[PDB]
Design a protein around this ligand. Structure first.
Ligand SMILES: Cc1cc(CCCCCCCOc2ccc(C3=NCCO3)cc2)on1
Lengths: 296, 245, 245, 49, 245
């Protein structure tokens, strides 16, 4: 009735093999007593890096050890623990005189790869899923607090991006806006994991267009639309000149984090957003350098 | 019973008498897409044996001065074989891999290659040297297919990241005094159940000489390195006409 | 599971991948002194890990003409390490040893060293050649400490006894085509429970090339031999000030 | 109450390990019958001095 | 536990550390003649140990151009040893054999000998070249005893049959990169329970280089091949005076 190779055909197994399990690691591993071992056949110290596995040699088999009850915690090295710390990710200028952002409004493309500290941290992993708490610290360039009313509006990709301080999009009938005086404590808001993918992707090795991929378009290599969350717009709430030069610092703090596929830490300086370019001529070593391997 | 091994998939069988065990990427065997993980509502194609097999794609020559090479993956196998076809006709693709890099020499030769799997391996440019120019790596460099590409600044994996740390990735070494081949088994890894085999490359295969090849003169100097990969649990959906890119 | 081995004592660990089993002197593991075997009424010190460890004391160069060397034991380890100290401060000493002599070469080299443990190894003089003079071996010869001493008439072990029979003593060979190290484990052996580590040497370590070192020219000619010993079950009693000799 | 490495610390074992025992040897060892043995794997004659 | 082996018969013991298992001709150990298989009514002699032992009869030199050699069997062992005697004094003979051909070289040498047992190995002449002359191989060629004989046209085993097929016979190869000796155990094979060891040769031993001996100059060029055979379950009947042929 069947053909056997069809009854066996393990094609369609949705479950992943595994091989490894997750164990409780509340504290560091304890050290149990060790004694001299003079025997042939058992060689812990001998390993083979070629295999591709880290040496599994225990302190106990390398020296006579005492007993130590390690109660040191590992809580501070969790992801939420490590990543859930507010950091600067965006900065916006609203000067009186200038060419940057006059007219009293600004459209900041929501991209957290513009500030080296925060960027390097996350670029530790390839994928990352999480909610976040955005805080907005506004004031004048002197750090002086001023009685001015702003309006921050999150504009999802597709929504009409404001073209002027008095644009119609500021009616914000469905977009979520926040009205704040620069004298009120920094506005703070909770943001869900909004993406069509299951996790944000710091690195996307490929294109999104699907076309020819000529020279003029290599601009899109590495551009993954599942991270383009839209823009953040801000404007002084009025009809006339703001009267004061403003600056908004955007701080993001992740929470409910899930990270996957750890990769090498950024070695060189950063040059552009969403683009791992590096200075070809100024390729500095990862660390410090000595004069000889035989001296400190 | 650990240095010798045989890998058999489809109608292909690889033999090795000096291998150093098998690495299973992130400790997970390649699986098919779950019913609750998928979204594409059309019933996919699972060619099985016609595409899940060992394609021996390329050979490089290791020289006392070689810098290293890489191959982007989803892609490398396109245009070649029935796999290639299903990857061009279908929009959506999904699959794990069994990568077997081989390279032998004599007991009188010496050297050591690092063989890693770097997921989402985005390439970067030298930025015009000074760093003022916002250049971008060309299609010929980001998606070299077979033949791979040679690294220009291996120390930073042409992407500003230390190769010294590349081992946090499924890797294996080919130390000539110890073995003559590496074997990594990577599962499908992406933030999506399926994606276009064409314009997205799930990971790159790195093969870099960390300890330079060397041998007294007179010993055969042609030391090749051959890549042989095999898709596993290949699934395709979203059938249309055939597409090259 | 017999040619590879690891010895771990104190904070020292020796590795070997070509050893030829372990010899246990007179088939007896080193023990501490029994309550009915002892006489010294004071409670002794058993430093354990601070003295029971692997001291890598010396290196000799094996040459196509080397005669052989010896090291008197209790002594060899004085002045060096915490062991040395306890041996100088205390009158009475007691301890067994784990001796590991190592020497490697290539598969293209050849030779064979005899490594023996001769208890109460009394040295003798050539008696002024003719045999009429009643000469006596000097302190520099009977108690050479580390650095050992070179034999002048190995055939008779500079003591009028055939080396051909030296194997009735805990021994092991270092045949280069077979191994690269010897491992003897001698227990404390004396006619007394304790004795002065200073003026009495329980036994000597002999390392003699019976089958001469040889190799075609062009192969590294510097073939060292290194001695590494480790006290076991060290006990000390009779504490006074520190004494050199 | 103790420190473990002290509870284990086999320091103070007055008895010698041994490994070998003394057996009765009133007469020389007898010779039992032998027959041809043509087999791979078992090599008595091969030793390692 | 498969590459090393020891064969012990009578008062002879062969050792080997690179053998490649043992072949048992036609899967049958040598047996004595059944009571219903025999016809000779006289009670036979079964010398056992005095004749069932390892006679190391000959040595040939393998050269980059050697053609190959053969030895007819029942015969090869006559005149040599107590076996020889019982074979001359008795009319009827019966016995199986343990043939051990050995030949070693270095890991830097290369070559491969085919070692077969061809039952009823009848030799043929070149028929005077043209094929018109009905010549016949001489006693010196059909029954060369020890020393064997060298093949003149190995491709056809000097008997018009392809050596390419000689493997349907109990055989074993001596590939120098793999082993250093062959071991065949042939049972008594004839269409009779007993026959004259003198004028009938149950089978021949073939030793032919299929893959030529070769080595870079400077490596010892004298590569011998030694034959060592041992009768098994030897039985003799029909006693008369001694006969040579
Ligand atoms: C009120 C209110 C709240 C806001 C801002 C909401 C911001 C939500 C941002 C979520 C950002 O997730 C990111 C993931 C990836 C990247 C990225 N940049 C380079 C490629 O990856 C940037 C942001 O505006 N107004």
């Amino acid at each position: 009735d069947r053909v056997a190779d069809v009854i066996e055909s393990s094609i369609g197994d949705s479950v992943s093999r595994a091989l490894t399990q997750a164990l409780p690691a509340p504290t560091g591993q304890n050290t149990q007593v060790s004694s001299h071992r003079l025997d042939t056949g058992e060689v812990p110290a001998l390993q083979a890096a070629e295999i591709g596995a880290s040496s599994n040699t225990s302190d106990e088999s390398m020296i006579e050890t005492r007993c130590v009850l390690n109660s040191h915690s590992t809580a501070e090295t969790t992801l939420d623990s490590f990543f859930s710390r507010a950091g600067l990710v965006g900065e916006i200028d609203l000067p009186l005189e200038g060419t940057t952002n006059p007219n009293g409004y600004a459209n900041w493309d929501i991209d957290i790869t513009g500030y080296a500290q925060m960027r390097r941290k996350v670029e530790l992993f390839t994928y990352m899923r999480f909610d976040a708490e955005f805080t907005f610290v506004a004031c004048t360039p002197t750090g002086q607090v001023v009685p001015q009313l702003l309006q921050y509006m999150f504009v999802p990709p597709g929504a009409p991006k404001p073209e002027s301080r008095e644009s119609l999009a500021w009616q914000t009938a469905t977009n979520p806006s926040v009205f704040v005086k620069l004298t009120d404590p920094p506005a703070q808001v909770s943001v869900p994991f909004m993406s069509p993918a299951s996790a944000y992707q710091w690195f996307y090795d490929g294109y999104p267009t699907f076309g020819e991929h000529k020279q003029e378009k290599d601009l899109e290599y590495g551009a993954c639309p599942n991270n383009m969350m839209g823009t953040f717009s801000v404007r002084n709430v009025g009809s006339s000149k703001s009267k004061y030069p403003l600056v908004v610092r955007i701080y993001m703090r992740m929470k409910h984090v899930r990270a996957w596929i750890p990769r090498p830490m950024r070695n060189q300086n950063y040059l552009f957003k969403a683009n791992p370019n590096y200075a070809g001529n100024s390729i500095k070593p990862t660390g410090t350098s000595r004069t000889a391997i035989t001296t400190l | 019973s650990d240095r010798v091994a045989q890998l058999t998939i489809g109608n292909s069988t690889i033999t090795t008498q000096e291998a150093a065990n098998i690495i299973v990427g992130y400790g997970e065997w390649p699986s098919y897409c779950s019913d609750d993980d998928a979204t594409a509502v059309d019933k996919p194609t699972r060619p099985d044996v016609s595409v899940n097999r060992f394609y021996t794609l390329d050979t490089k020559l290791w020289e006392k001065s070689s810098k290293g090479w890489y191959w982007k993956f989803p892609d490398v196998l396109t245009e070649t074989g029935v796999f290639g076809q299903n990857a061009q006709f279908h929009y959506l693709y999904r699959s794990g891999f069994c990568i077997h890099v081989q390279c032998n020499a004599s007991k009188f030769h010496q050297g050591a290659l690092l063989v890693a799997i770097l997921p989402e391996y985005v390439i970067g440019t030298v930025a015009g040297g000074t760093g003022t120019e916002d250049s971008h790596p060309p299609y010929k460099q980001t998606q070299p297919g077979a033949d791979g590409f040679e690294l220009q600044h291996p120390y930073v994996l042409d992407a500003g990241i230390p190769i010294s740390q590349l081992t946090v990735c499924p890797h294996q070494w080919i130390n000539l005094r110890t073995n003559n081949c590496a074997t990594i088994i990577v599962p499908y890894m992406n933030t999506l159940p399926f994606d276009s085999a064409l314009n997205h490359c799930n990971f790159g295969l790195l093969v870099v000489p960390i300890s330079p090849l060397d041998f007294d003169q007179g010993a055969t100097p042609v030391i090749p390195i051959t890549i042989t990969l095999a898709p596993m649990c290949s699934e395709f959906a979203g059938l249309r006409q055939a597409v090259t890119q």
